Amino acid sequence: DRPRFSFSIAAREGKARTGTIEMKRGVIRTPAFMPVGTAATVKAADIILGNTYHLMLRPGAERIAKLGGLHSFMGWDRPILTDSGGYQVMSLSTKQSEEGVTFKSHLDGSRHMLSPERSIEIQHLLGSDIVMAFDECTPYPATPSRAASSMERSMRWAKRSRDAFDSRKEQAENAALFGIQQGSVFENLRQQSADALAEIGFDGYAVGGLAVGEGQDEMFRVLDFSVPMLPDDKPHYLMGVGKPDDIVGAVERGIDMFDCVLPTRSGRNGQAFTWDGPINIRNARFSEDLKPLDSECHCAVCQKWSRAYIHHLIRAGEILGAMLMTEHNIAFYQQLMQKIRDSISEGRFSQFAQDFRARYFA
Amino acid sequence: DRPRFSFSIAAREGKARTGTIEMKRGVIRTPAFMPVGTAATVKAADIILGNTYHLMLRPGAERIAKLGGLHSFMGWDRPILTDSGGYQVMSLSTKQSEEGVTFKSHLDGSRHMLSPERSIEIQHLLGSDIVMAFDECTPYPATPSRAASSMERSMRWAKRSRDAFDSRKEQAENAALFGIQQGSVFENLRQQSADALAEIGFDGYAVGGLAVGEGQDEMFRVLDFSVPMLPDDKPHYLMGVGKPDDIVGAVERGIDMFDCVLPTRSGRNGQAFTWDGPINIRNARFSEDLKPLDSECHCAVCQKWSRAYIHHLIRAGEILGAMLMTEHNIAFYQQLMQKIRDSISEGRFSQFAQDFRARYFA
Ligand SMILES: CNc1nc2cc3c(=O)[nH]c(N)nc3c(CC[C@H]3O[C@@H](OC)[C@H](OC)[C@@H]3OC)c2[nH]1
Ligand SMILES: CNc1nc2cc3c(=O)[nH]c(N)nc3c(CC[C@H]3O[C@@H](OC)[C@H](OC)[C@@H]3OC)c2[nH]1
Ligand SMILES: [Zn+2]
Ligand SMILES: [Zn+2]
């Protein structure tokens, strides 16, 4: 019988690590990509995401619980990770206070408060296995004073999240809780945030406040000093990242877990990922191209259909085209993660990262 | 090795028949439903449709031929049926003459003529296995004089279609040609059309000019006298039909083959077919319904996911929801055809039709 949570590092190369998270509902191989569950039929990825913000508004967390929780609802018996919901409230919905955030639903005008306690309860009702602390994703750019005030509030909210999670027996005994580091681009604030989170104690640690407009060079610079501040023996989750090259560089800097809307968003908009870079399949140059989306990809789409046919479907308005693109993109991301894990385990990740970049950007 | 074309009737009940069409690329069990190939990944339906009108405009028949034909393009090695293209020209695009029809492409302004000879050549370039004669689908309603003039032109075009098909060796030796009966709702014109088509000689015979606004009672009345006029020993294809109850009643009247945009169109618009009638899954009454789309359906969607989850996906704007609906609808139609074939073979089709209607309309 698997434990509630156990992270083991099997191999390392530089700052990169590969290993496993064991949870009751399954094993997660790291570095891991965690896809959205609703964009395609995901098969046994090791873990999928639930969209807390959307689920709060439709059909509501209480209703999801009445339906048996997300595992039953989505037909997925393996681990599920949910965010704390505030990122999207600030992004898509507001009135803020030390208690939390209040906002109105665009779907029907209903009122909603979101606090550390309510966010944890929502994630409990959804039934997720990895629960995120309720934080504030500081806007970018931010002055040092505003970044500090924001981070300090997030650390108070992290303690309230910890206490709310520990108060619910089923959650404390069966799920895991991750804390989220903030501090914008400032090394001293990132250090204070890491120290506060480690003092509270979490099962895993996320790097928050990135992928919010800063650009890859700046993101990598912040990761260079921020990831070593987190406990080495716990998983590191970079929220909102990212493109394939973002993932490779973040793994080089010690990140273990990733989520990004790109593969599913790109698939609905004609963009396919390949080892030679992204392609927009709607372009006329693909109308007679008999090659698969990617020449090495092992996914079911690339085994059967050509670029020309997928181009045709999308140009004809057939949803089948976008579905095949999305299935290929999710599979490409998982093949990327498998190559990353194998190369770290084999001591050739540095070479893989170099070869990957030379071809992806050629 | 299978013949170019051979239709065998295995069992009969009243006017209903069940049997097989053997062609080089496979066997087709009848009565058959023939789905669009582009709306979902169709698995070995016995035959799928190519959309001649769309393919003529994008990417063009010559280009499809350059890509290897529709079988290679779509990844489908079994039979394909194509229409002659004029129905949609009159429906979606015109200048008519005894030579054919000319029209302009809305996609790019290019000019296109469509004649019996060009329609047959287009279907040859597409590589389809069952080729339809180039006809005129008479508008409804039509006066007797206009229905007669229209039908007479279609019969001249049927002879030109026959001759064009026979002139192309690869087509004549490997494909089959169906003639299309016209005559609107008029028994004497339907008889003249059937006589003309049988004198020319075709591999199968379609009932054209229906599902164009006349309503089920009138359609059934026309089928009552029109189907017995066609050769009994050849397949009968009712073009454009239809809803599940249309199919059952048409089989009762001697039809062997069906095509309809409903299951794929309905699936993209929130309508699912069930043995208790169609349901619109977007309705709020399905938001907490844990039953599958249909309680008896054996499709992969109904084995795994609830009405509540499919409702959620569609309401959230996820294309996955429409894809699952479409896959269920195609599977439902094939389960309907299997029940029809089994019941005719077993001598219980009359009872099946009665039980089907009582429950579908309850
Ligand atoms: C795009 N850039 C990006 N930077 C982010 C930074 C943060 C952060 O500091 N705190 C929190 N709590 N969330 C963040 C998030 C949202 C992730 C969720 O976004 C959701 O997708 C929209 C996804 O869940 C389907 C995921 O939840 C697991 C970020 N997204
Ligand atoms: C909806 N009612 C309906 N009544 C019809 C009557 C006729 C007719 O008299 N002659 C011809 N030639 N075609 C007809 C058609 C079009 C069928 C095609 O319609 C195409 O779907 C749009 C489908 O191919 C993807 C199919 O081709 C196999 C009809 N459709
Ligand atoms: Zn692929
Ligand atoms: Zn089903």
Q: How many residues does chain A have?
A: 362
- Domain CATH for A33: 3.20.20.105
User: Domain of A161?
Assistant: 1-362
N- to C-terminal Cα separation, chain A: 47
Give how far Cα A194 sits from Cα of A18, A199, A218, A226, Å.
22, 9, 19, 8
DSSP state of A153: H
SS3 content of chain A, % helix, strand, coil (to 5): 45, 15, 35
Q: Would you mind telling me the total number of residues written for chain B in this entry?
A: 362
**Torsion, CA B200, CA B202, CA B207, CA B209, rounded to 10:** -60
Return the amino acid letter for B252: E
Q: Which residues of B touch A319 (CB under 8 A)?
A: 39, 268, 319, 322-323, 326
Resolution of the experimentally solved model in angstroms? 1.4
In angstroms, the Cα distances linking B342 to B10, B12, B178, B295, B345 are 11, 11, 26, 20, 5
SS3 B6: strand
Contacts of A210 (CB under 8 A, 6+ apart): A219, A222, A223, A238, A239, A240, A241
Q: Which two tokens stand for residue A142?
A: 């931010």
Which chain A residues have a beta carbon less than 8 Å from that of B313?
A: 38
Residue A200 Cα distances to A35, A299, B126, B229, B231, angstroms: 29, 43, 67, 85, 84
Cβ-based burial of A116 (10 A; exposed 0-12, middle 13-18, buried ≥19): buried
Rg (C-alpha) for chain B, rounded Å, is: 20
Query: Among A44, A56, A39, A110, which residue's Cα sits nearest to residue A265?
Result: A39
Experimental approach was: X-ray
Sheet with A204-207, side-by-side order of all strands: A32-33, A257-258, A236-238, A204-207, A176-181, A130-132, A80-82, A48-50
CB contact under 8 A, A290 and B67: yes
Which of A304, A312, A315, A324 to substitute to test the interface with B, most B CBs within 10 Å? A312
Which chain B residues are within 8 Å of A269, Cβ to Cβ? none
A195 known ligand binder: no
CA dist., res. A237 & res. A37, Å (int): 18
Chain centroid to Cα A42, Å, comes to: 15
How many domains does one find in chain A?
A: 1
CA distance A11 to A249: 18
Helices (H), chain A: 52-57, 61-66, 70-74, 86-92, 116-126, 144-167, 169-174, 187-200, 216-226, 244-251, 262-268, 300-304, 307-315, 319-346, 349-360
Tell me how far CA of residue B46 lies from CA of B27, B221, B247, B336, in angstroms. 7, 30, 17, 14
Instruction: Give the integer Cα–Cα distance in Å for B86 and B90.
Output: 6
Please check if B260 is assigned to a binding site: no
Owner of token pair 């990957």: A356
Q: What is the DSSP letter of B178?
A: E
Closest CA to A103 of A67, A160, A59, A57: A57
Chain breaks in chain A (C to N over 2.5 A) after: 44, 93
CA angle B357, B359, B360 (to 5 degrees): 65
Token output for B179: 């003639």
Cα-flanking dihedrals φ and ψ of residue B169, to 5°?
A: -60, -50
Dihedral angle computed from the Cα positions of residues A17, A155, A240 and A18, in that order, rounded to the nearest 10 degrees: 10
Secondary structure (3-state) at B88 = helix
Quote the tokens at residue B173: 């030796």
What residues in chain B have their Cβ under 8 A from chain A's Cβ atoms?
A: 38-41, 54, 58-59, 63, 66-68, 73-75, 268, 287-288, 290, 304-306, 308-309, 312-313, 315-316, 318-320, 322-323, 326
CA A8 to each of CA A1, A13, A81: distance values in angstroms, whole numbers, following the listed order: 16, 15, 19
- For chain B, the distance separating the N- and C-terminal CA atoms, rounded to the nearest angstrom, is 47
Going by alpha carbons, the residue nearest to atom 22 of ligand 2 is B261
Q: Please report the sign of the dihedral spanned by the C-alpha atoms of residue A164, residue A166, residue A168, residue A173.
A: positive
